[PDB]
Design a protein around this ligand. Structure first.
Ligand SMILES: *[C@@H]1O[C@H](CO)[C@@H](O)[C@H](O)[C@H]1NC(C)=O
Ligand SMILES: *[C@@H]1O[C@H](CO)[C@@H](O)[C@H](O)[C@H]1NC(C)=O
Ligand SMILES: *[C@@H]1O[C@H](CO)[C@@H](O)[C@H](O)[C@H]1NC(C)=O
Ligand SMILES: *[C@H]1O[C@H](CO)[C@H](O)[C@H](O)[C@H]1NC(C)=O
Lengths: 33, 252
């Protein structure tokens, strides 16, 4: 789980919901085909 | 003057979309406007094509047909494309090029990033000009070597940062469109215009090392790394130009 803010900083989980930020999640799971 | 058949104009209709998506720099749209009047009963103006793209990838609601139109859920018929699909993909294939594009209704959440807001502003920094594939350590790149698939996958986590191919034949996979690239330079990404420019938030470069044309495949890109703490719990991004060889190695 990576959070990028204002295209110039990376933040930890706490500020993932702040203004101008967006998050990239690694997905690891199983699913029905 | 020449009249286009249903399938002839549909391929040209897909060539228009592939061009507006900036996946191709060329198109064959001769006869498309008349084909849209004869088969769709409308002027497929550039404004209309933006709406098709905008709806199909972001705002489209309900089922979609082969021409990216949406509808909420015997005798011969003149009007084509009356069979819609709830969710899935369209093979946007112009004959000259194709891309497997997924509808926005087929994702749990929007997989496009608004690069008008999230454009990168990264500071260059000292770093190795050559990077080994087995030892990539970048925020924007995650590499998996599948010896059983005979394949290498490069997960690109910051599509705003260009990844430049050099003598590669690769397949791009994403939650937006899947397509093949074989031309040198920056990886092309589908661009959706919706009150700003949208591109896939993440994508994957799949490199078949079984293909001998990939024997010297090389990526040129910036390796984004975390820098100093500037605010509470945040660090400024840094990057350094580096070259990653993929095609090489040993047999046996
Ligand atoms: C991004 O920039 C805006 C405008 O300056 C600012 O309010 C905001 O705090 C910034 N975000 C972070 C996480 O620093
Ligand atoms: C995309 O970002 C720009 C710049 O921040 C903003 O003006 C625009 O409203 C955004 N578009 C959408 C559809 O959210
Ligand atoms: C990749 O090519 C682009 C041009 O599209 C250029 O801006 C960028 O600097 C190149 N990247 C590297 C690491 O040389
Ligand atoms: C016409 O519309 C009907 C809808 O009931 C069928 O989709 C049919 O196959 C269509 N025929 C043509 C030629 O488009």
């Amino acid at each position: 789980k990576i959070t990028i803010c204002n295209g110039s900083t990376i933040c930890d989980q706490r500020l993932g919901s702040e203004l101008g930020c967006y998050t990239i999640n690694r997905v690891r799971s199983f699913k029905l085909g | 003057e020449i009249i286009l058949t249903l399938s002839q104009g549909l391929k040209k209709y897909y060539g228009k979309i592939l061009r507006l998506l900036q996946l191709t720099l060329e198109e064959d749209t001769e006869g498309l406007l008349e084909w849209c009047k004869r088969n769709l009963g409308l002027d497929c103006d550039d404004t209309f094509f933006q709406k098709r793209i905008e709806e199909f990838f972001i705002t489209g609601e309900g089922h979609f047909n082969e021409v990216l139109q949406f509808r909420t859920p015997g005798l011969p018929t003149a009007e084509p494309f009356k069979s819609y699909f709830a969710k899935g993909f369209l093979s946007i294939d112009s004959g000259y090029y194709s891309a497997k594009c997924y509808s926005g209704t087929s994702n749990s959440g929007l997989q496009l990033i608004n690069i008008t807001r999230h454009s990168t502003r990264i500071v260059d920094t000292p770093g190795p000009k050559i990077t080994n594939l087995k030892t990539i350590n970048c925020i924007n790149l995650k590499a998996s070597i599948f010896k059983e698939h005979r394949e290498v996958e490069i997960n690109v986590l910051l599509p705003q940062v260009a990844v430049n191919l050099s003598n590669c034949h690769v397949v791009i996979k994403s939650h937006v469109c899947d397509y093949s690239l074989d031309i040198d330079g920056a990886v092309r990404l589908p661009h959706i215009y919706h009150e700003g420019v949208f591109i896939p938030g993440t994508y994957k470069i799949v490199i078949d090392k079984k293909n001998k044309l990939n024997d010297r495949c090389t990526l040129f890109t910036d390796c984004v790394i975390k820098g100093r703490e500037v605010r509470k719990g945040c660090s400024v991004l840094r990057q350094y130009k580096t070259e990653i060889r993929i095609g090489g190695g040993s047999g046996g």
